Amino acid sequence: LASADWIAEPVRLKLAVKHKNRINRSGELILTSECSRYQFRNLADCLQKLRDMIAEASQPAKEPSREDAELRRSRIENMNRERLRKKRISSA
Amino acid sequence: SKTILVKMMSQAGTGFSFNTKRSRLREKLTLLHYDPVVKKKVLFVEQKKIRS
């Protein structure tokens, strides 16, 4: 991702921030395809995912919409966790 | 106490009709049904009378 000079610096930064879950320790972004039995279709799926990520990072109107079905539990858990974290005592 | 069979057409624009049983001594029937075309609660009104 760092050495990929065919996309802009802000785009590279956005891919690094968003897709860090699929970035190797060597900095190599990795795309996976398993759907079809033909390597042609598998490579087509990989390239389509790459194009989609590039377009998503390039478009500036991304509102970062989030799902709610599986996010309410996370929100409640964070709420209740900082409810205990709110203790204010100096340390270190 | 004879009933009636009436075909109701959706008022959501799309053509979707369902048959329901109604009493003869009742007025023109109008209910709320589910239209699979639009997937919403839509008012249905009695359009035709088919079977006695």
Partner: protein, 354 residues
Amino acid sequence: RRAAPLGPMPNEDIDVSDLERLKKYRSFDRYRRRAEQEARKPHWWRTYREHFGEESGPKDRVDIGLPPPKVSRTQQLLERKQALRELRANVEEERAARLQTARIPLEAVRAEWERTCGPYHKQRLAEYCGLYRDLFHGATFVPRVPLHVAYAVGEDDLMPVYHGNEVTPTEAAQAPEVTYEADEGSLWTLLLTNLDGHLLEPDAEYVHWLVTNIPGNRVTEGQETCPYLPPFPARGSGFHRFAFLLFKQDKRIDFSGDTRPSPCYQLAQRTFHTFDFYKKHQDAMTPAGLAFFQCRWDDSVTRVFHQLLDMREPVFEFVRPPPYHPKQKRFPHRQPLRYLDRYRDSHEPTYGIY
């Protein structure tokens, strides 16, 4: 044919005749209490608990812990009745109670709870979370002495670590501060153990922070056997458990086999067994403190894996067993057309010879 009952029948005690003179309950909740009391008894017939794992029913757990504090029952009861009387003598309390506008000193209530009955609730929570089963497998101890653990996540921001809390690895990257009341005549040892997260051995556990020969409360003054290592739960398997075990010891225990090097970044060297540790040093130390928290993967675990452990971050997932399908029939009678799709390897068209 008939068979004699193998014990007393449930409703064979009350008299069938003369039901009018027999007292009856008129309350569904009262019947519910009676039924739940009956359902917990060891009946001689097949029951739900026997099939669904009552865990061998009663078990004589071995207690390895400090004796309970000795208090005068009569004096305690006298003081408690005196306090209740002096509280009830007030009239402002009565007015607040009737007007339903009265607050509670929650911090105080927690203080007395942890003082008098907190250890037992903590022990039963450890039982429910399975700490004893994986640390000693045959022994239970009551955390007689409170142990307050807290991480520092900022300049004025403190994350407490209670029993069963959830703590982020980013919040737990730094070493915590631990406090517990103790006189300046005793020695203590503190152990942070990662119960779940060992990649190789399911029955083993990791070390994170072992400090020994703590003089009273000043843990920083005591020597550290194992340097602190931040939690590193895997991305797939979440919600690992990390337990703080506090041992009170009489003698000054000195050892060389449990000592770790200064870096201590090898998972092979950081392999632990609390059962073996307590078997080796059982004569002196006695467990008296407990503090365990749950921990899941976050954005700092990958940094811990890469920079510190010098490895590749492993990623897991929660896979499910494949759906069960019966043996395929030559002529599936009255089955839908999609029957042939249940036994299809792939949704691609194979032309064998064409």
